[PDB]
Amino acid sequence: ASATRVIQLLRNWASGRDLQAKLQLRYQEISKRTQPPPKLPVGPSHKLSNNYYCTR
């Protein structure tokens, strides 16, 4: 956060905890908004043999 050391110390004392560690606002730890393309797997019935529907 863009908070000065005096303000950070006052905030931590008033709260009683280290707020600068577990900040609620998200800055950079979020995942990227442009993720690589995926490749999802097929299910257990995507086989060319021994897969008659009467058995499942």
Partner: protein, 260 residues
């Protein structure tokens, strides 16, 4: 009926929001009736989807894939955080404590985009469907859920700092609405309304569904049956949800998200 401000008789008149959901469901297919459950409890949406999905799957005699069940529980507990935030903050808001409402609703906003990033809707995701879920988790969603749940514990502790030990909050809740264990069962109470009176009963423990028998969590139990004890149960349930969420974020299995 008030004698001064003492409540002689309390008569709830309901039906002002009766939209005939049960009748409208009869005219629509099982898939078309799924969005109706999102609107039943519009504070806990995906939990309603799961209950309807389980009922249909039980009749269908099918089984959702292992990965879908974990997604149903991961978002089942994120849904629980959404409701308990609404349940506690608005309860405190009506008492007079307005500040914790805004603190937690920012976290409630962060969980809303978890709904939106996985379904495309902030509240009514219609994501949990009979047979699993609709789509697989987008890449990078699990990491962002971890980042949220990492710091969400402090938010609950900040909430407790303002309410748990406040003598004004205790005066408004301690020994208010005391429900005996026997009366709660007879009157049909369930959930926190039972465990707030000491009754040890949780449907995730006694009658587990999906993968709730593979996660570890503690059931908070009240001791006096008043509003304050049920307040502590809901606050502790939020903490226990984070315990479940962490397990779901580490035990997520590979596989498909729909019954094949």
């Amino acid at each position: 009926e008030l004698s001064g401000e003492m409540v002689r008789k309390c008569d709830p008149h309901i039906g002002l929001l009766h939209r005939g959901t049960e009748k409208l469901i009869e005219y629509k297919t099982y898939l078309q009736a799924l969005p109706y459950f999102d609107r039943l409890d519009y504070v806990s949406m995906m939990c309603n989807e799961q209950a309807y999905s389980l009922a249909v799957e039980k009749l269908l005699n099918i089984q959702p894939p292992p990965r879908a069940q974990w997604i149903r529980v991961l978002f089942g507990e994120i849904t629980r955080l959404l409701n308990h935030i609404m349940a506690v903050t608005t309860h405190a808001l009506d008492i007079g404590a307005m500040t914790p409402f805004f603190w937690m609703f920012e976290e409630r906003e962060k969980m809303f985009e978890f709904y939106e990033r996985v379904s495309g809707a902030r509240m009514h995701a219609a994501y949990i469907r009979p047979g699993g879920v609709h789509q697989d988790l987008p890449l990078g969603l699990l990491d962002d859920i971890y980042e949220f749940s990492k710091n969400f514990s402090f938010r609950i502790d900040e909430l407790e700092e303002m309410l748990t030990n406040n003598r004004i909050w205790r005066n408004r809740t301690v020994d208010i609405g005391v429900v005996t264990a026997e009366d709660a069962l007879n009157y049909g109470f369930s959930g926190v309304m039972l465990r707030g009176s000491g009754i040890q009963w949780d449907l995730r423990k006694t009658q587990p569904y999906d993968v709730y028998d593979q996660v570890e969590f503690d059931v908070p139990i009240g001791s006096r049956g008043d509003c304050y004890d049920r307040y502590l149960c809901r606050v502790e349930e939020m903490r226990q949800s984070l315990r479940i969420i962490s397990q779901c974020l580490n035990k997520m299995p590979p596989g498909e998200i729909k019954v094949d």
